[PDB]
Amino acid sequence: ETVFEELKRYVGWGDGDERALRSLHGAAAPHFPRLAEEFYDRILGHEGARTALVGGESQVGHLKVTMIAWLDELLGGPWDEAYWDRRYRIGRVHVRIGLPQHYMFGAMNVHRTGLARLAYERFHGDPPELERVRNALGKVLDLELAVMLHTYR
């Protein structure tokens, strides 16, 4: 059993969560640019986080596209060994530039609430799909935060 497979076991990951995320994917995807911008605005609004923004104009576009791509993979999958390998590398990037890990809590909270809103917008008229999507979002984001934080060892 791989470490990432173990983590999946711990949160109760299954095919149902992968179906649910893919179901939200097509509906949320058009919103990704706005979600990335909102996320980046939260960074700009936080004195400490914004000290990472030393790369000038090019960095602004890079933060946007990276987060769009991240959200795309988040919801589209697959959530296999290659996926979690890449998430581990993403984590390490933040560790190597010196971002304190406590920022990641706040940052995952942004996505939690933002993706929860999109799920409601698409699925309010289909209560079982809404509930299931929400539980899938909780699981995937718990995995994501667990992996990111693990890179700080």
Ligand code: HEM
């Ligand atoms: C849920 C939280 C976060 C996710 C999913 C995330 C995602 C990513 C991804 C996908 C990359 C590109 C990694 C690569 O090179 O392969 C990245 C790079 C980066 N992230 Fe984050 N990030 C998060 C939080 C933060 C926070 C809070 C900051 C605060 C400033 C930050 C600043 C950066 C910086 C500075 C880079 C390097 C690239 C650049 O500056 O253009 N990230 N992040």
